[PDB]
Specification:
Elements: E1 2-3, H1 8-13, E2 23-24, E3 33-39, E4 53-58, H2 69-78, E5 89-94, H3 104-117, E6 126-131, E7 135-136, H4 139-150, E8 153-158, E9 169-170, E10 178-183, E11 201-204, E12 208-212, E13 216-220, H5 223-239, H6 248-254, E14 257-258, E15 271-272
Parallel strand pairs: 3-5, 3-6, 4-5, 6-8, 8-10, 10-11
Antiparallel strand pairs: 1-2, 7-9, 12-13, 14-15
Helix pairs in contact: 2-5, 3-4
Length: 279
């Protein structure tokens, strides 16, 4: 399958080189995988989800995404037009309020929820969790992300938007999950992207077009936007049987575009998520 005039990020993850416009992907497109988007929620009604998205848990008064962040992330994972894994099943877990903020306890609860809830779902190709969120280092938040990973969920988490070492941010600093830095369309590290040794992989993070609340779309920047590319790429590659939840992060790093990024500090991986698709 080839999506012409795709969002630059989708084109980037299916190309060895920047500046392409077509997203090339196996037509399986993450069919049979599940991705939990642990965020502000998902406007499941958005036509771009094609009925493949549903809210499964909220920790606030409504399951409704009143922010747009979660819908944007979910769109990058598996919307028809803006998603890496265009046939994956999306599950919204609303751990962030409609201002996009969430208590650590709530975020931990959402990770514990996914670890259990996946046992109730039909995800024959495996389960991914996209955590486009974070704050200061928390051993309990890292431990929660480690548990979700250990339960057999491919956990992708944002490195963070601090232009600092991800070691001081959670769950970014949890070694066992897939910590995702952001790149721009010119193969630069995104100016805001966290770095450091704990980063596993970069994904497109700057000026990422995706779904938004009210059935709309918008372009926003963040390691929050890079994370769902990797989460979507994990769902995609697990559907193809190329990797498992336990090994997807390592597989994505092993199969990444190596050395394509600029402004990569010494000790940070120079690896950009890449689907290695050959028609
Ligand atoms: Ca290259
Ligand atoms: Ca890691």
């Amino acid at each position: 399958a080839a999506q012409t005039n795709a969002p630059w990020g989708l084109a980037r993850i299916s190309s060895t080189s920047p500046g392409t416009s077509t997203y090339y992907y196996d037509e399986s497109a993450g069919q049979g995988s599940c991705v939990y988007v642990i965020d502000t929620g998902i406007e499941a009604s958005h036509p771009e989800f094609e009925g493949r998205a549903q809210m499964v848990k909220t920790y606030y008064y409504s399951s409704r995404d009143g922010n747009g962040h979660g819908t944007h992330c979910a769109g990058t994972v598996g919307s028809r037009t803006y998603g890496v894994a265009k046939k994956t099943q999306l599950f919204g877990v609303k751990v962030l309020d409609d201002n996009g903020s969430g208590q650590y306890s709530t975020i931990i609860a959402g990770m514990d929820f996914v670890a259990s809830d996946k046992n109730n779902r039909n995800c024959p190709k495996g389960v991914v969790a996209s955590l486009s969120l974070g704050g200061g280092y928390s051993s309990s938040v890292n431990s929660a992300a480690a548990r979700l990973q250990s339960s057999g969920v491919m956990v992708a988490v944002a490195a963070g938007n601090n232009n600092a070492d991800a070691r001081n941010y959670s769950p970014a600093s949890e070694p066992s999950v897939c910590t995702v830095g952001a790149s721009d369309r010119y193969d630069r590290r995104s100016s805001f992207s966290n770095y450091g040794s704990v980063l596993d992989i970069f994904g497109p993070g700057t000026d990422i077009l995706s779904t938004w609340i009210g059935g709309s779309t918008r372009s926003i920047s963040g390691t929050s936007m890079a994370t769902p590319h990797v989460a979507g790429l994990a769902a995609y590659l697990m559907t193809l049987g190329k990797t498992t939840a336990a090994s997807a992060c390592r597989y994505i790093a092993d199969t990444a575009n190596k050395g394509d990024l600029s402004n990569i500090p010494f000790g940070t991986v120079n690896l950009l998520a890449y689907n290695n698709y050959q028609a």
